[PDB]
Design a protein around this ligand. Structure first.
Ligand SMILES: NCCCC[C@H](N)C(=O)NS(=O)(=O)OC[C@H]1O[C@@H](n2cnc3c(N)ncnc32)[C@H](O)[C@@H]1O
Ligand SMILES: NCCCC[C@H](N)C(=O)NS(=O)(=O)OC[C@H]1O[C@@H](n2cnc3c(N)ncnc32)[C@H](O)[C@@H]1O
Lengths: 502, 500
């Protein structure tokens, strides 16, 4: 009854079968039909039926084994997210002696192959009356009673998938999101590409990277934090529309919305601006929600199942707000003119404001970091429905093109849904001279203690000197999308094997 | 002089900014692509000029030929297509502006063209512009590009000047899209598993090591996702697949890049025999669907060498590794149940020395066998060939062969002398898997940097019950190589790894 004792007893038993030549891990079992197809094919049977003219082979894991005498055993077979009952009757088994022998060997959790006839019990339960049951793979451990401890579910995802059917549904939704994006972009003529994940200098975002070393080339390398720079070089190369759904690596802390490795979808469209991208984003996100959930409305539980429930409407158009103007409205005070957002005086003003508003910001207390903390405190929390926060200051967007009418701002937007950032996009900065200037400013910030400041990428600047057409780029966090599409407040729910403390 | 051109063009572009001429405009509205423009106006006759139709197109200037002072021809290219821009002063918005824009434009500049469709007296489809806008200038002089180093170091230049490069990458994307479609139709669930692991596994390879600061932990970049996939099958997801990057800290060569893409899939209740049939159907169907024929031309010695047509029509040839190795060597090898003895290792060592087959330390049986197979069997696999029943000593994760002692239910697919797929009936016995892991740990301590680490978490997962399963792995880059008649993996990688 003790788990460790159960494991020792079952292990010795299975080992005995091996020495005796009983083959507890057979090489092959021919499955004639899946459980799902079996259910749809014989669900029309009537209570008490027993189809003696059809013999099929099925397989699955034993979820329960209840004895109804010495000659009747019921096995609850599960697989493919469905259930199928195995009505093991001694009179129908190949022999009474073998009926007792196989059932005494079976335990809950074992993988078995079943050869029998379809039938339905007197109570109306579809079943398979077996002629022969074969042990395919025994379960040496005791399975949980259920399984609710988050730590165990995340450290042994196979147990979570075996015991909780809602978990499989979340990962099916996640795959539907990725497949929907690929179909959407492929239809628009985008070419799916793959760019390096190991870089001499990481770039395309503000983040601390992972460091590794290549022996044969005697070189230090960084895991990519974003593929943005390689994508723009491809647009310079003449591939007007490219996209890539892949992993990004950021050596930062783990929390409800951050994992060291995560999946994003980045795409670049030549001859487009951030205004075109807002419309494309509205069409893609709203259509994705409708296609997967059936409607434009989604229920949101910010405080778990026992909390308030909010209806989130994804019907376009999405609301748009300007970051600086809304931040001033939230603070009830006017901020400096946008063309002064790069001065030290503006940094001191924002620093003082953060202190007075109890908005914390760990060093370095740079304008970009202080603004980010203020936006997360006063604007992000109010973005329940899909909201576009636009025209970010240049100081927070070293790769975005300057705003054509608002000095000091950029043609950028971020899509927020259920208090989380989903997309990051902007009109691409294609002026090589101005890009190098912003890179030089980033290097100074880095040399002064900023682990996330960008490195100067001269190779990328050189590519921009060859001519990058006016372009608009976009990045979406696939994990974050799966979170709001599965009503999950923790990113670990949408990652098969999330990063964990040892 | 290239540098002088860059300095002069830079000052000219800088002057445009100070003069308020916006050399990098924010938005240009394209009415139709170059491809659609050509297909839509293919019916014109020489001398035609549809003055009642105005369209806006865009592209890069590849050539600029002057004819008079009032006529300039711009060769606009984009999307792998070309469109001539017949800039006539009489048709431009104004003669003064015609001279101004043309004095600013140079070869390589990205421009927007607003004009009418037309055809020259010589019969060339063109666009007669009303206004030309400089969208993004090219500050460098372009090659009037064959140097491999430059093509791989500045892939944008390669893509701008040689159309065959873009075609290879379109084929590469078609391969991946085809596999997803094939597997999705068979009920496989596309999944994503960790690329950063506490313990690397799923292959015999040297990994990359990194460090997580917030958690003060050493991490390894994944060398294969195999172990996570099998854990997913234990979890009840009978069919999973993942097309993603793998990282191996090894040397670069014609068929190896430190980061590469593979497609791995696991299907419960199948064995390696079922996987051979699936491989034949997928590979043959993919070759036919993308290239139009079941045959592909292969140039092992470049364009000026022998060309062999390889037929991908199933079934593929099957050969047993040990049996054909004996025939290729003309010598009888030890019995398969003796492959773990020191006497067998010495025997394989002598054979390698006598046949001049090199093998860097450690000279273990598994490594000596791998060298002999690559020298006597792989080179002879031009047509799609399955090499099967590898010894257990070289397959720590494959299930033992049900009839041949010492062998496993494993196979490798070889095409045009390159390894394409690696598959086998999965070992689902946790005690025997742990034993093989212990043997791998011994080999690691004895000089084999590629030997596997013991993964107790995976062994524990096998203790919960892994149904009989067969797994498979395919090198996407290698497939793109043989599908584009490329002998260097750098041809099918947008940015291949390069020495600084
Ligand atoms: N050219 C326009 C910008 C393109 C995208 C840009 N290169 C970029 O990296 N933007 S990002 O905000 O830094 O990341 C893109 C999205 O990835 C999501 N994400 C980002 N970091 C994490 C982390 N740590 N965990 C989980 N999800 C994350 C998040 O939704 C972002 O909106
Ligand atoms: N469970 C059955 C086996 C599944 C696949 C197994 N985990 C595996 O990794 N096999 S592999 O041979 O080591 O890699 C799979 C394929 O990736 C290809 N490949 C392997 N190494 C490289 C490298 N360095 N560069 C480019 N391509 C590579 C190669 O074609 C392989 O056939």
């Amino acid at each position: 009854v003790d788990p460790n004792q159960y494991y020792k007893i079952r292990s010795q038993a299975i080992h005995q079968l091996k020495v005796n030549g009983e083959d507890p891990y057979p090489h092959k079992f021919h499955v004639d039909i899946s459980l799902t197809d079996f259910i749809q094919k014989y669900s029309h049977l009537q209570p008490g039926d027993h189809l003696t003219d059809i013999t099929l082979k099925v397989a699955g894991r034993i979820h329960a084994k209840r004895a109804s005498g010495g000659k009747l055993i019921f096995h609850d077979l599960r697989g493919e997210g469905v259930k199928l009952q195995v009505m093991a009757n001694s009179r129908n088994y190949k022999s009474e002696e073998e009926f007792i022998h196989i059932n005494n060997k079976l335990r809950r959790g074992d993988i078995i192959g079943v050869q029998g006839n379809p039938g339905k019990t007197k109570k109306g339960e579809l079943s398979i009356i077996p002629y022969e049951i074969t042990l395919l793979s025994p379960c040496l451990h005791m399975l949980p009673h259920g399984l609710k401890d988050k730590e165990t579910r995340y450290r042994q995802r196979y147990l979570d998938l075996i015991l909780n059917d809602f978990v499989r549904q979340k990962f099916i939704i996640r795959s539907k999101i990725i497949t929907y994006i690929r179909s959407f972009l492929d239809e628009l003529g985008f070419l799916e590409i793959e760019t390096p994940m190991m870089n001499i200098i990481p770039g395309g975002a503000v983040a601390k990277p992972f460091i590794t070393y290549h022996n044969e080339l005697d070189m230090n390398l960084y895991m990519r934090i974003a593929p943005e720079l390689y994508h723009k070089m491809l647009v310079v190369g003449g591939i007007d529309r490219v996209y890539e759904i892949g992993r990004q690596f950021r050596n930062e802390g783990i929390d409800l919305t951050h994992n060291p490795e995560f999946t994003t979808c980045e795409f670049y469209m030549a001859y487009a601006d951030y205004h075109d991208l807002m419309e494309i984003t509205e069409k893609m996100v709203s259509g994705m929600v409708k296609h997967i959930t059936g409607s434009y409305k989604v229920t949101y539980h910010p405080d778990g199942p026992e909390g308030q429930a909010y209806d989130v409407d994804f019907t376009p158009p999405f609301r748009r707000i300007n970051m600086v103007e809304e931040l001033e409205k939230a603070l009830g005070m006017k901020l400096p003119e946008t063309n002064l957002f790069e001065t030290e005086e503006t940094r001191k003003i924002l620093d003082d404001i953060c202190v007075a508003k109890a908005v914390e910001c760990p060093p370095p207390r740079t304008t970009a970091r202080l603004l980010d903390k203020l936006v997360g405190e006063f604007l992000e929390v109010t973005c329940i429905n899909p909201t576009f926060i636009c025209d970010h200051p240049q100081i927070m967007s070293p790769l975005a093109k300057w705003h054509r009418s608002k000095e000091g701002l950029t043609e950028r937007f971020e899509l927020f849904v259920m208090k989380k950032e989903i997309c990051n996009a902007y009109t691409e900065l294609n002026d090589p001279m101005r890009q190098r200037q912003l890179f030089e400013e980033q290097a100074k910030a880095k040399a002064a203690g900023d682990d996330e400041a960008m490195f100067i990428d001269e190779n990328f600047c050189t590519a921009l000197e060859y001519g990058l057409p006016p372009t608009a780029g976009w990045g979406m966090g696939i994990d974050r999308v799966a979170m709001f599409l599965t009503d999950s407040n923790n990113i670990k729910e949408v990652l098969l094997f999330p990063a964990m403390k040892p």
